[PDB]
Ligand binder design. Structure first.
Ligand SMILES: CC(C)[C@@H](NC(=O)[C@H](CS)NC(=O)CCC[C@H](N)C(=O)O)C(=O)O
Ligand SMILES: [Fe+2]
Length: 329
């Protein structure tokens, strides 16, 4: 018998306003969720998720093998040595079902100083041909800034929840240098479904992606309406109900580090379900040099003995570790 996780729906609209007490009431709800299962749905967020889903589906269903090779990351195309993060992550017919397209900050151009310095984790996005995918790049870049704006507001909520001024996290989340990424993931319907793409957990559950903590400050996720996620609790895994009108929010391991595990990064996994669906995360990453001094909200003085960790070092190590543990996606 698998139980269902308590995942509250939080109206985040006050975080865009100037009613300070209303913002505190949202923060209290974020705090409560972050100390319980670690997940909540953000509702009344203002993002046109219908258009997001439609445009993503048009892209996934119309891109051809030729185009996928041309956009592929270095794991799938040895010619693209500069594409570790950004580009197309191919499926492998009969072996690997999932495929995805990842893009980074649109402001990362050949002229950007971090690109000119060849700083790790910064890359210039690759895009399909405008004539084959009209409006796709325009849509995707605007979506990046829309979800950036929602994420900025959420970070104000997290700061207030922890007793800090509302710009405590957001001041490090800047359009000019954020390492945040969008991933447009297609999980396909397949018949027969390749057995190599199904993992069996210790408890017998069939999975598409094994247990992990997120490499992020927070993760801001839109998924279509097919139940798939489970969160670990002390009493075992619990199902997270789907909601295709809201964003599912959780903390990543950078938040756990800087709060001395007061807000844990929830361990979660993806159940195998044979259904055509979309999983569209935005990983809220800071800048390469961003450092937040850790603190412990449990102590009156907030003192922590944990070392400050540069976000760039955290991200570089975290991305590689996730591939080594859970496989190349
Ligand atoms: C659980 C979902 C978020 C999704 N999984 C995922 O997106 C998983 C686990 S959080 N994430 C990753 O592989 C990290 C992608 C990082 C990205 N290439 C980048 O360079 O920034 C899924 O549906 O499998
Ligand atoms: Fe995750």
């Amino acid at each position: 018998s698998v139980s269902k996780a308590n995942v509250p729906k939080i109206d985040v609209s006050p975080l865009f306003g100037d009613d300070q007490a209303a913002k505190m009431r949202v923060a209290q709800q974020i705090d409560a969720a972050s100390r319980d299962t670690g997940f909540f749905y953000a509702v009344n967020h203002g993002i046109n998720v219908q258009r997001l889903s439609q445009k993503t589906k048009e892209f996934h269903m119309s891109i051809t093998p030729e185009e996928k090779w041309d956009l592929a990351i270095r794991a799938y195309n040895k010619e693209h040595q500069d594409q570790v993060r950004a580009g197309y992550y191919l499926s492998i017919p009969g072996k690997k079902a999932v495929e995805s397209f990842c893009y980074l900050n649109p402001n990362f151009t050949p002229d950007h100083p971090r690109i000119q310095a060849k700083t790790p984790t910064h890359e210039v996005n690759v895009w399909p041909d405008e004539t084959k995918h009209p409006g796709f790049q325009d849509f995707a870049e605007q979506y990046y800034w829309d979800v950036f704006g929602l994420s900025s507001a959420l970070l104000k909520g997290y700061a207030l929840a922890l007793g800090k001024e509302e710009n405590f996290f957001a001041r490090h989340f800047k359009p000019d240098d954020t390492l945040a990424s969008v991933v447009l993931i297609r999980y396909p319907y397949l018949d027969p479904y390749p057995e190599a793409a199904i993992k069996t957990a210790a408890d017998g559950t069939k999975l598409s992606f094994e247990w992990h903590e997120d490499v992020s400050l927070i993760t801001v996720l839109y998924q279509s309406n097919v139940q798939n996620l489970q969160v670990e609790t002390a009493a075992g895994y619990q199902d997270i109900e789907a909601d295709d009108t809201g964003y599912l929010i959780n903390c990543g391991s950078y938040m756990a580090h800087l709060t001395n595990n007061y807000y844990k990064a929830p361990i979660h996994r993806v159940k195998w379900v044979n259904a055509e669906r979309q999983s569209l995360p935005f990983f809220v990453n800071l800048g390469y040099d961003s450092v937040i001094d850790p603190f412990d909200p449990r102590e009156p003085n907030g003192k922590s003995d944990r070392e400050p960790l540069s976000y760039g070092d955290y991200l570089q190590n975290g991305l590689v570790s996730l591939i080594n543990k859970n496989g190349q996606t």
